[PDB]
Scaffold this motif. Structure first.
Motif, short mmCIF file in Angstrom:
data_model
loop_
_atom_site.label_atom_id
_atom_site.label_comp_id
_atom_site.label_asym_id
_atom_site.label_seq_id
_atom_site.Cartn_x
_atom_site.Cartn_y
_atom_site.Cartn_z
N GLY A 167 0.73 -1.24 0.18
CA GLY A 167 0.00 0.12 -0.06
C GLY A 167 1.00 1.25 0.14
O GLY A 167 2.03 0.96 0.05
N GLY A 215 3.30 3.89 0.84
CA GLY A 215 4.50 3.99 1.85
C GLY A 215 4.62 2.74 2.92
O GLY A 215 5.29 3.11 3.82
N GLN A 216 4.22 1.50 2.43
CA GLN A 216 4.38 0.48 3.49
C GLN A 216 4.45 -0.72 2.81
O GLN A 216 3.64 -0.94 1.73
N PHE A 220 30.29 -0.23 4.27
CA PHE A 220 28.97 0.15 4.87
C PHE A 220 29.50 -0.04 6.48
O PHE A 220 29.52 -1.24 7.14
N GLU A 265 22.79 5.19 3.65
CA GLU A 265 21.93 6.39 3.01
C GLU A 265 21.08 5.59 2.28
O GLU A 265 21.32 5.15 0.99
N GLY A 266 19.74 5.65 2.43
CA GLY A 266 18.67 5.30 1.54
C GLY A 266 18.68 3.86 1.14
O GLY A 266 18.12 3.33 0.11
N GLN A 267 19.46 2.72 2.16
CA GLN A 267 19.48 1.30 1.55
C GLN A 267 19.87 0.50 2.85
O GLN A 267 20.31 1.18 3.85
N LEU A 268 19.54 -0.84 2.65
CA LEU A 268 19.95 -1.85 3.47
C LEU A 268 20.53 -2.92 2.64
O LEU A 268 19.87 -3.21 1.58
N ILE A 328 26.21 0.62 -4.28
CA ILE A 328 27.37 -0.10 -4.15
C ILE A 328 26.69 -1.40 -3.15
O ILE A 328 27.15 -2.42 -3.22
N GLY A 329 25.81 -1.13 -2.56
CA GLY A 329 24.70 -2.31 -2.29
C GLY A 329 24.29 -3.46 -3.08
O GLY A 329 24.49 -4.60 -2.92
N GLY A 389 4.07 0.90 -2.87
CA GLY A 389 4.81 0.80 -1.44
C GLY A 389 6.29 0.58 -1.67
O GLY A 389 6.97 1.32 -1.00
N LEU A 390 6.52 -0.27 -2.45
CA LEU A 390 7.94 -0.87 -2.40
C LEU A 390 8.56 0.12 -3.54
O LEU A 390 8.02 0.98 -4.25
N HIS A 420 14.03 -3.66 -4.92
CA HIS A 420 14.61 -4.39 -3.93
C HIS A 420 14.95 -5.87 -4.49
O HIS A 420 14.24 -6.15 -5.76
N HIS A 467 19.32 -6.85 -1.08
CA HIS A 467 19.51 -5.38 -1.24
C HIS A 467 18.07 -4.59 -1.22
O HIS A 467 17.24 -5.02 -2.06
N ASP A 468 17.88 -3.55 -0.14
CA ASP A 468 16.42 -2.82 -0.42
C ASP A 468 17.07 -1.29 -0.57
O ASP A 468 18.17 -0.93 0.06
N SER A 469 16.54 -0.63 -1.52
CA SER A 469 16.63 0.89 -1.84
C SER A 469 15.53 1.50 -1.72
O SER A 469 14.49 1.33 -1.95
N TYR A 470 15.70 2.59 -0.68
CA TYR A 470 14.48 3.41 -0.43
C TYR A 470 14.42 4.78 -1.16
O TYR A 470 13.19 5.31 -1.31
N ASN A 471 15.62 5.04 -1.90
CA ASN A 471 15.57 6.24 -2.44
C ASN A 471 16.62 6.68 -3.17
O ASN A 471 17.59 5.69 -3.22
N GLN A 499 19.39 8.31 -2.71
CA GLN A 499 20.43 8.46 -2.02
C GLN A 499 21.16 7.14 -2.12
O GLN A 499 22.50 6.96 -1.65
N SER A 500 20.45 5.73 -2.30
CA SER A 500 21.11 4.46 -2.15
C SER A 500 22.49 4.50 -3.30
O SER A 500 23.57 3.86 -3.21
N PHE A 501 22.33 5.25 -4.38
CA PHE A 501 23.54 5.67 -5.27
C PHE A 501 24.51 6.35 -4.91
O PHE A 501 25.68 6.21 -5.66
N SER A 528 26.69 6.44 -2.38
CA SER A 528 27.95 5.99 -1.86
C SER A 528 29.06 5.48 -3.07
O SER A 528 30.12 5.43 -2.94
#
Ligand SMILES: O=C(O)c1cccc(C(=O)O)n1
Ligand SMILES: O=C(O)c1cccc(C(=O)O)n1
Ligand SMILES: O=C(O)c1cccc(C(=O)O)n1
Ligand SMILES: O=C(O)c1cccc(C(=O)O)n1
Lengths: 265, 265, 265, 265
Positions: A223, A225-226, C146, C224-227, D130-131, D212-213, D216, D232-236, D238-240, D242
């Protein structure tokens, strides 16, 4: 009160676990089994259920019932025998808990009506794993709030069918609640055939098959944002046992036939 | 019918999202805001809510109510103002949806009784994220079947409190159902202090703090041969919005005060 | 060429798996075991290693070596015996693969120097699970990019120590690369003691203990922005076997002692 | 020493992040941009790069180079311009870091040879995260030990292509190491078309598309008794960053052209 249990099909993979479960449950006593072997089964390869005074072996259910008068009969036999077993129990004040499918529509209706008139509990459980059934039950509740969902199921690499029966049932349960729609951008296109998976009523289903894995399912609800995820991981047939336990306890409390543990958890 | 909504505190981080949500919901119209600024807020740094004929700005709620007669008032203001706001709405046939805590016990009782006598809906929602609340609601149902559970929550590395409020509430909700017990072998011993986490009524809680993360929780339910996990991941404040939407829709349908969205999802 | 393997301690949980692994590997032949039983072990409870012409049982390693002349000796015995075993192999042109710790510093130096002068391979593997060792090896590479990381390890609820040995080793390996620092906001405060976990050189470590689980670890790298996450799940002792296989194959190719499979994967 | 950076295409989504990254990196100074706008871009909708003395805007790269003499040029422009940009930098003692594809085979060979003769660094990075690149690099190492693998990638529900470019590249990288084979039981059969996903050289790839996603990927490596997963999970965007940072730092240290950050991490 103590619950005196007889098990049909004790030597099956599931049966063996159910035997151990009933024997270890404080409030249950295994009092008999219904069992018989293939006429060509060498004892060296296919041993008899182990001989004991406490757990007599019967070939005929009517005889078991009259002799032992169990409270509950747990049927882990075969689809072609469940109806005759269920009816026989219901007419003799034995609560049947049935662990395989196989009823016709007409057969199920007969058992349902008989249970209701006799005010006697019966549970039919196509899936005994409470974690798997909760997963499915909760998914169908969640789908009221998050209509966009995908299912990912993962099994060992000897499994012949994709998707899994669990995944199919899950999709069916969701689809009772979720308005029918397809997902993904209307103009998306696969450049490698199959990437988006299978679709059940618009719900994507993906099937992973790898050595190492046993039986695993995740349900992903998207949904804004989640992401809300439900996941079940089964590492062995003990995963089924809390469902066997719950079913035996709960059949004693109900006075009608319930089909699917989702309808009583 | 259309639902005419006024929002208190439109300029907050949550408020800004709620504004966009209400404006984009087909069956809702944003008809007014209750707003005021710090006397030292330079406009260049802290702009006014944007001027429009369609969404007039009021400083006083009584005046907003009498002039605009909104169906619903969504209160995203502060704990010290919620009680006076709620009572004022309830006495004027406006359904209040309150998005922050701050009532005393006595205050909540007064609003509850007034809502009931006026047969008017009120929702108090300490957490608007439906995925987070479903997670908690489902966890407390699951805990009837799987009493051994752990909570892992993960947030960004600017968060000052551990564990999170969500994790605490989750543990409280589980603990209503789960018999109180500690977990882990009775003789286990930490060789590095803290490895087993915090404990709420015996439930272990672990807190992860890393750059990159936003707000995330997993609830892990163990049992023989299996693991059942519930997980919620929030990537931004839109995660809250389906709860704002549901609350505004549902307040119109109920005739009493409900505290916590778990009590109505 | 075929690799002729002898195993010390075939009856252990690990030993039993190693036996099956070597017997099933196409290019390996199990040619002997080093074994002996407790003088009070009833055969009915603690059976002998099964008698066969193909896999003779020796009590004395010198005798096994001279009689069978195995290519490789896989030592799954005890820390107090590994040094004497290793030296004996190295002086007799047998490559030892040692599956338990227990050397002194001085002992290891002697075996290392002897291996080097004899140009004979030796592998000491404190962890045979390749997935676990890759996880650790990759984590220490990732930590260059990281530096903010947490470790979550999960085991069954009979485990006595927290954190796990694997988690400790993982943290040690990361800490070779990662600059020492603490993580989380400088002013964060636990309101329930232990929520943030244990700390090894500033790295948080969290320990989950639940029925159902076997052995599991995740390593979470924030930025930043990732996991970026590395995860290993072990469902049984077969998880160790690809490491046994790799070690036996690779010992034949190297001409010195290697301690830890991370140093050769 | 300080690294003086010019950026081509500062106003792009990626460009905007790269600007902020370079401006915030202690050892870097943004000294110029190469930029120009569409002749129909209203300033009210499509603002100019903001005017400053510290970051002059050039339309022509030759002019930027001669006037500013940046150490590094970060090219975030378009595939049709990268070759001319790269050659121009390489002939003027400027290290180019190129953030989009678009070279022909012949074009890349020319830049590679020129870089080598000039002993000047050049990085071409089709993926700066990098991730994500570590994930891919590590996967191709892992595939030497675990040949059975699946890829699951997940994106928002506006994405037009399945599978993702990242998933395709990942599969290509694995396939350099992993012997070509199909996976799953030879006799398995889909009962709902597509459940097993797409296949690249026998590697299954599954594509999830949900609101939502963001972006990933998980890579699942199966083996006996275990599962090894990279995620690897990228939320925005900024993931780029590093990767932008690493590329600018590392280009100064190398004396040849490197294509793909996997070749230098
Ligand atoms: O849902 C299913 O089909 C299922 C469930 C558990 C195990 C298996 C299996 O091993 O095939 N299949
Ligand atoms: O449960 C909580 O405390 C919570 C929830 C969302 C965000 C945050 C936060 O960013 O602190 N904290
Ligand atoms: O790292 C460890 O300590 C470990 C690894 C596998 C199993 C166990 C265990 O079962 O205790 N412990
Ligand atoms: O690998 C890809 O194709 C990719 C990577 C990041 C974002 C997206 C996208 O949003 O489409 N796609």
């Amino acid at each position: 009160m103590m619950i005196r249990v007889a098990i049909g099909g004790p030597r099956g993979k599931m049966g063996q676990e159910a035997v151990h479960t009933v024997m270890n449950n404080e409030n249950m006593e295994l009092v008999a089994v219904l069992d018989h072997k293939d006429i060509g089964d060498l004892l060296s390869e296919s041993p008899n259920f182990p001989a004991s005074y406490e757990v007599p072996v019967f070939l005929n259910l009517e005889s078991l019932i009259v002799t032992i008068k169990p409270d509950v009969f747990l049927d882990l036999t075969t689809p072609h025998q469940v109806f005759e077993h269920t009816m026989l129990c219901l007419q003799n004040n034995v609560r049947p808990v049935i662990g395989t499918t196989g009823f016709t529509d007409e057969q199920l209706q007969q058992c349902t009506i008989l249970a209701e008139v006799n005010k006697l509990g019966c549970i039919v459980a196509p899936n005994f794993a409470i974690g798997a059934v909760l997963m499915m039950k909760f998914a169908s509740l969640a789908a009221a709030y998050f209509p966009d969902v995908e299912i990912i199921e993962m099994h060992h690499d000897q499994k012949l069918d994709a998707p899994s029966g669990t995944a199919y049932k899950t999709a069916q349960m969701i689809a009772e609640v979720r308005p029918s729609h397809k997902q993904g951008h209307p103009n998306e296109k696969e450049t490698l055939e199959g990437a988006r998976g299978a679709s059940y009523d618009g719900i994507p289903i993906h099937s992973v098959r790898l050595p190492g894995l046993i039986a695993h399912q995740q349900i992903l609800f998207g949904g804004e944002g989640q992401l809300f995820t439900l996941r079940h991981d089964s590492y062995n047939r003990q995963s089924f046992m809390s469902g066997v336990t719950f079913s035996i306890n709960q059949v004693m409390e109900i006075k009608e036939l319930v089909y699917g543990l989702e309808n009583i958890l």
